[PDB]
Amino acid sequence: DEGMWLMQQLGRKYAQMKERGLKMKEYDLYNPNGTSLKDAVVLFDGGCTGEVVSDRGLVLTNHHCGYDMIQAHSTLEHNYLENGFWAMREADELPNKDISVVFIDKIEDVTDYVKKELKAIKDPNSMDYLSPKYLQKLADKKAGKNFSAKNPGLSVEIKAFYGGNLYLMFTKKTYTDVRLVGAPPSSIGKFGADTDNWIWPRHTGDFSIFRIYADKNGNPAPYSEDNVPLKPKRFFNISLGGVQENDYAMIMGFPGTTHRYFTASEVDEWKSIDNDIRIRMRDIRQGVMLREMLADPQIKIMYSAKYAASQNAYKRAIGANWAIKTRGLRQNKQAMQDRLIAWGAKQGTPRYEEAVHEIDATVAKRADLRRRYWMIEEGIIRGIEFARSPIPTEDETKALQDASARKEAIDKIRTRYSKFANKDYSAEVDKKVAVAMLTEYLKEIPYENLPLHLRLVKDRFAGDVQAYVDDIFARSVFGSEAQFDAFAAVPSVEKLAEDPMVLFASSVFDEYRKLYNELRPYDDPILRAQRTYIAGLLEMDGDQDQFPDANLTLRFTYGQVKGYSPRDNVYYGHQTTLDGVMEKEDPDNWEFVVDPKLKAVYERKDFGRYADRSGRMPVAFCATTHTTGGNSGSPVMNANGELIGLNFDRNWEGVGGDIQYLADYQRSIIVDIRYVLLVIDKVGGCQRLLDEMNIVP
Amino acid sequence: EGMWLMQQLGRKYAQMKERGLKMKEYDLYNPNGTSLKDAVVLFDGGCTGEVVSDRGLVLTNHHCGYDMIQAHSTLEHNYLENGFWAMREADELPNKDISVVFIDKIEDVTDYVKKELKAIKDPNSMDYLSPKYLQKLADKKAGKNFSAKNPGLSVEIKAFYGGNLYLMFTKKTYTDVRLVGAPPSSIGKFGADTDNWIWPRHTGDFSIFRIYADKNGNPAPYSEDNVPLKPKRFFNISLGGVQENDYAMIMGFPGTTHRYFTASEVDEWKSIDNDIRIRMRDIRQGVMLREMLADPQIKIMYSAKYAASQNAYKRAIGANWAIKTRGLRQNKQAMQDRLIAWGAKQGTPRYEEAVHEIDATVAKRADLRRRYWMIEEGIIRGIEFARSPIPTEDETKALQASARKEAIDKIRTRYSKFANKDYSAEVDKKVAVAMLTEYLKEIPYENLPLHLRLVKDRFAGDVQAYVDDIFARSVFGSEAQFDAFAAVPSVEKLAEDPMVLFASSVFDEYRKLYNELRPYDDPILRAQRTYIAGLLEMDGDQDQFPDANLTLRFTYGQVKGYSPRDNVYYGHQTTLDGVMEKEDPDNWEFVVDPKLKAVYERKDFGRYADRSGRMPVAFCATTHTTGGNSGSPVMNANGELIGLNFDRNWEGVGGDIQYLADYQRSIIVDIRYVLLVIDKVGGCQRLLDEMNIVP
Ligand SMILES: O=C(c1ccco1)N1CCN(C(=O)C2CC2)CC1
Ligand SMILES: [Cl-]
Ligand SMILES: [Cl-]
Ligand SMILES: [Cl-]
């Protein structure tokens, strides 16, 4: 609903934005033929958003976006992840390998051009209209001969929108010398840690600071000690006026994916297959894992990251299923398609109804296969660690069956075994997880649909899953270090070909690939029918109140700074304060430890000009803007386009917002810029960063 | 902020009127006439109730009438799960061992008691707080045969303000109190233990009884000839509901408070009582929950034991949160420093000397009190085999006449009650191993119960081996082991039994500690009499309420929510929509009654829904309540019944020491929801018809 709009759509939305509180001129925010605020927004490291906040190329993004760079520069002597990092001079800023920042220099509507090129149809069922390779050939044809060589730093890209009904060409300027400037300690940058992931109220100071470097003329250049900070076209002014309830707020960023045009049958499938299987399987896996971590402190160390990684999409699936159950997502998709079908019946065009029918029939036909795919992927591929145990390659098997190439094959198999059975791997914990996961899997998937090796549970082990799992480890070459070393001393192809763990791993990966290959053909009829479906929706209600699905391209969203009621008699306001950080402090819980410098700032009330009118220190706020994954680090703007915060998360109640925006529950979780400036100032002491920013009263 | 004596209504009336009270002072409480006070009862010795009709109908909580509902429940008529609704007066069920107490008269007898006390002689005498001594004074004042001349009536004198004020109560007790109605446990106990001490709350915590009496309305024990009581006063039911900031008041019987604790007593309560209970119960509950989650049969056997341990565990967590965040220690220190400065100015050092006596007594008993709480939480309540059978002196002087079979039958009966259908020796061994490991780390060898010295002396510090040996060799370790003993019993076998020796040794230490600690109570009590006398002489009795002591009190405040933490607000009222949001059919605690779910779907709310069409369930207020206030009537500015108190939020449990204006709330079931359940769930129209319902 309240969407993720193309920059092209700013003109037709401007009057509504102005009535909602926007004060800046249209072309100061986005001008297709000149400098605008859009020029200060970047795609940070391929998956996050960032923003230029100074005339010397300073960039703000999330702490979780700059996390890998902070970690790569951290050592036992200088742990920047734990204590933070504050370069006191430009020369002290740390270079980063494999980093990039992408500016969206120009955006052009190329729909007529692409649709004319597509008319050279050899097959009406061709998927070239969505092919990155085909669209790149069209982009290169339009840009010119050797565009990259004639315009160093620039690149051209064409993307499909609205299921293939609109095409845009993007001219991108990429910088790869992006240096680490500053970061708060992890105690501030990831205060809630995994406990507060997807949670509002939130008290996390999720920010990090970088700087774009370039050659003498401000042109992209790879890392060089001769590189100078970039003087940009445009940068954000920082506001210290703060936020109040109902204030207009807007974001620009790169939301990755949405499913706003799902049919009601696709919502049912997402719930009953994707989400229910992920929920059921991850709850079993996490339950066994948590019992083991709580019983042994060494298991807690080894499995904490694996447990946290499994919980993230588990919580998302719980939040999404809550929306399907309580917010009528299925019903609203059904009403959307019924309205198009009725309109098509009056227009004399049955193609829209035929398109929705094709989608329903394809969804109904692939149900059993998709259920088997999610069951094996969640239950075994992700669920059981020994599923990713070493499988000897065709060349490794050939090598072991007269040359020194045998010792090469054994060293390659050993390297993979050592990575599988690493310092974090527990065979005992894995056997307990596998016994619970396989018991559920064997209950859901019938004998004739099982991966060949799992048929042994009934055929050889009399249905005893524990005995089958015990036998895999007792007899396998990868069951223990001593078992691998005995194999490595006297290796034979015959031993590997009959190895119970190799056979299990090969069997489950064979079934996983067979299911993927059987399911792949069903994607194309749905994609082709969605092109007709979305064309009808656009022709009927206009490209005015229905936004194109997110596809990792630059979008804007607007709303207001506003809290919400999660449940009966409970209200979550629009703003958190430093008090909330102090209430959550737990020194014996690594997630909720409070930085001593920050604790003293709170006690002394050394808030300077960053505190609100009442003298309280703001930390974070939430807004009715429509965001998703990819929007992490996005600039949050005032009615005047000044920076008031950075988006860093969204509440679990609004995760169903990827299918249907939830006005009364969905919120973007934003770190207040006043808190960002307080941490740089009072925790980092990095005055030079404050001085180079343009701070407005 | 307080729990005021009825005598203090005159002094508080002007403030109550400015806060919204509309009723006349003597219509609420009249010392020599009929008033609203005459419709409040002490229900079954520990709860509050209220008369709501001219035929003696009484409302109280579902958890207050729980034992009576359970005693009348069978597999054929399970009233606990299905509810109970007597469709005629003759169908109302009698209850053995039940009582309702009316407070007929209250008199200040301070001068009388203090004059009688002047003839003591021993200055340290504790007769000024003795129930026996005060009863002798009560009998002397009322008359020799008072209860014979005034049937159903009895007198009682209680001390207040640490012995600085005395009141005589004339009580009328009725023991024929019949069960009339109750919602199913799914409504009466909706949150079950998960929502205990929790606001927002969606529990319809109510049950209905009726007072029966003889032909003249006089108390009489159960008789089929008994007729319903026509009371002199009953509450009118209001259907006008509540709004945020509305004046609310309660009358009831709060049991205990510690409003005059010194700062050293707050430190002791935190560092000994609460920290030990928290640490020990967390270990016990952790092992118990692991076992209940791994075996569904263990979950059935240990659910009630787990829930019983959690209740005071949660209270202790809430109390320690207040000590840590609300400055309870600091405010007590400021209170005593202000009295000490005032005493220094007046030239009276007795108040400073009294605070010093309390501090020195608290400091002197620290190690003993730590050892007491450690054994009580760690072993007496922590380990089930601590309450295993200990052969009596009569039983040992019988095994070594042929009444050896009678001794074995008595020991067998006790063994069968210890190792019952809910007892798991394996679960108990795991709990004991974790509890004793912590206990042995905290209590040094020279302070251990004699049998626990064997962990170091005989078992090389292996707690698991010591516990395994107790069960392997004990006659109470298994059924087969008991039966082998019962066939060939000898006193020598019992005298050397590892479980008997453990149980005897831990109970000996527990009693020795209790006996060593008991003498420290008296100097503190005597010093508190002087301390509270000074506080009252300095600042007066009109802000400083007397500690709760299971006597009738009133409290007033407003219907108001609160902010539990940064950016979170809990409103003043919950709705039926909140019950539906919490529904979980595969969680026995959050199952929703089908008749109630249907009422919500069809919106069959009648005259009970609010102005917006939403059905209220519960509300909260800034009244000051504690244990004993369960079932208390909640009144309007006009004295009409708007709800029943049934709980208080965990954030306000520190309110027994210091009232917490911004956090402490009484959790009340809305009377509109009570009527909705009687009407649409129970179908008991006759109960609605006999109540006086005001528009
Ligand atoms: O360090 C290793 C290891 C294995 C292979 C290379 O390093 N491990 C894994 C297994 N571990 C355990 O299971 C701990 C007893 C709990 C922790 C030690
Ligand atoms: Cl058509
Ligand atoms: Cl909504
Ligand atoms: Cl009466």
- Ligand minimally distant from the alpha carbon of residue A663: 3
Contact by Cβ (8 Å): A447, A458: yes
The finding on whether A614 has its CB within 6 A of some atom of ligand 1 is no
Q: Where are the domains of chain A?
A: 1-256+543-697, 257-542
Nearest CB to B574 within list A294, A568, A572: A568
The alpha-carbon gap from B325 to the nearest alpha carbon of chain A, in Å, equals 9
Task: Identify the residue whose C-alpha is closest to ligand 1 atom 17.
Answer: A423
Question: Which is nearest to A665 in space by CA: A434, A320, A330?
Answer: A320
How far does Cα A280 stand from its chain's mean position? Answer: 22
Task: Compute the C-alpha angle B264/B269/B270, nearest 5°.
Answer: 100
The Å distance, Cα B151 to ligand 4 centre, comes to: 13
Q: How many CB atoms lie within 10 A of CB A335?
A: 12
Question: A53: burial class by Cβ within 10 Å (0-12, 13-18, 19+)?
Answer: buried
Kindly state whether B663 is in contact with chain A, defined as any CB-CB distance less than 8 angstroms. Answer: no
**H helix or E strand, kind and range, residue B210:** strand B207-213
- Ligand minimally distant from the alpha carbon of residue A424: 1
How far does Cα B564 stand from its chain's mean position? Answer: 24
A256's tokens: 């990755």
The finding on whether A443 has its CB within 6 A of some atom of ligand 1 is no
Contact B561/A569, CB-based, under 8 Å? yes
Task: Identify the residue whose C-alpha is closest to ligand 1 atom 3.
Answer: A423
Task: Compute the C-alpha angle A456/A462/A463, nearest 5°.
Answer: 75
Atom of ligand 1 lying closest to residue A302 CA: 17
3-state secondary structure B516-583: HHHHHHHHHHHHHHHHHHHHHHHHCCCCCCCCCCCCCEEEEEEECCEEEECCEEECCEEEHHHHHHHC
Contact by Cβ (8 Å): B436, B463: yes
The Å distance, Cα A662 to ligand 3 centre, comes to: 4
A516's tokens: 């993927």
The alpha-carbon gap from A467 to the nearest alpha carbon of chain B, in Å, equals 20
The finding on whether A293 has its CB within 6 A of some atom of ligand 1 is no
The Å distance, Cα A658 to ligand 3 centre, comes to: 13
All residues of chain B having their beta carbon less than 8 Å from the beta carbon of residue A577 are 566-567
Question: Which is nearest to B688 in space by CA: B181, B228, B266, B11?
Answer: B181
Contact by Cβ (8 Å): A689, A181: yes
| Rounded Cα distance, A568 and B608, in Å | 18
| Rounded Cα distance, B285 and A141, in Å | 71
The terminus-to-terminus CA distance of chain B in angstroms comes to: 31
- Ligand minimally distant from the alpha carbon of residue B58: 4
Atom of ligand 1 lying closest to residue A428 CA: 13
Question: Which is nearest to A644 in space by CA: A527, A561, A564?
Answer: A561
The verdict on whether A64 is a catalytic residue reads: yes
Task: Identify the residue whose C-alpha is closest to ligand 1 atom 18.
Answer: A423
The finding on whether A298 has its CB within 6 A of some atom of ligand 1 is yes
Question: Which is nearest to B68 in space by CA: B98, B99, B91, B40?
Answer: B98
**H helix or E strand, kind and range, residue B51:** strand B47-51
B667's tokens: 């959790």
The Å distance, Cα A351 to ligand 2 centre, comes to: 4
Nearest CB to B567 within list A568, A569, A573: A573
All residues of chain A having their beta carbon less than 8 Å from the beta carbon of residue B569 are 570-571, 573
Contact A580/B565, CB-based, under 8 Å? yes
Resolution (A): 2.0
- Ligand minimally distant from the alpha carbon of residue A355: 2
The verdict on whether B205 is a catalytic residue reads: yes
Give me the count of residues in chain B.
695
How far does Cα B492 stand from its chain's mean position? Answer: 44
The alpha-carbon gap from A584 to the nearest alpha carbon of chain B, in Å, equals 9
- B97 φ/ψ sector (left φ>0, alpha ψ -120 to 50, else beta): left
All residues of chain B having their beta carbon less than 8 Å from the beta carbon of residue A570 are 200, 568-571
How far does Cα B291 stand from its chain's mean position? Answer: 29
The terminus-to-terminus CA distance of chain A in angstroms comes to: 35
Contact A571/B571, CB-based, under 8 Å? yes
Please give the method by which this entry was determined. X-ray
| Rounded Cα distance, A694 and A235, in Å | 9
All residues of chain A having their beta carbon less than 8 Å from the beta carbon of residue B570 are 569-570
Contact B571/A575, CB-based, under 8 Å? no
**One-letter amino acid identity for A66?**
G
Q: How far is CA B298 from CA A422, B287, B292, B304, in A?
A: 37, 12, 5, 11
Q: Beta strand B693-694 with B237-238: parallel, antiparallel or unpaired?
A: parallel
Helices B425-442 and B275-294, axial angle in degrees (round to 10): 150
> Phi then psi for B606, rounded to 5 degrees?
50, -130
The finding on whether A295 has its CB within 6 A of some atom of ligand 1 is no
The residues pairing with B105 across neighbouring beta strands, listed in sequence order, are B170
Q: Which residue of chain B has the CA closest to A579?
A: B566
**Ligand 1 pocket check: which of A292, A293, A298 to mutate, most ligand atoms within 8 Å of Cβ?**
A298
The residues pairing with B214 across neighbouring beta strands, listed in sequence order, are none
The Å distance, Cα A530 to ligand 2 centre, comes to: 14
Q: Alpha-carbon Rg of chain A, whole angstroms?
A: 28
A428's tokens: 């005992």
Question: B423: burial class by Cβ within 10 Å (0-12, 13-18, 19+)?
Answer: middle
Contact B567/A201, CB-based, under 8 Å? yes
Contact A569/B290, CB-based, under 8 Å? no
3-state secondary structure of B95: coil
User: How many beta-carbon pairs below 8 A join chains A and B?
Assistant: 51
Kindly state whether B567 is in contact with chain A, defined as any CB-CB distance less than 8 angstroms. Answer: yes
Contact A572/B570, CB-based, under 8 Å? no
Question: Which is nearest to B336 in space by CA: B361, B358, B360, B319?
Answer: B358
The residues pairing with B2 across neighbouring beta strands, listed in sequence order, are none
| Rounded Cα distance, B277 and A617, in Å | 37
- B450 φ/ψ sector (left φ>0, alpha ψ -120 to 50, else beta): alpha
Contact B568/A291, CB-based, under 8 Å? no
The Å distance, Cα B644 to ligand 2 centre, comes to: 67
Kindly state whether A570 is in contact with chain B, defined as any CB-CB distance less than 8 angstroms. Answer: yes
Mark which residues 82-101 of A lie under 8 Å from B by CB: none
Q: Beta strand B40-43 with B47-51: parallel, antiparallel or unpaired?
A: antiparallel
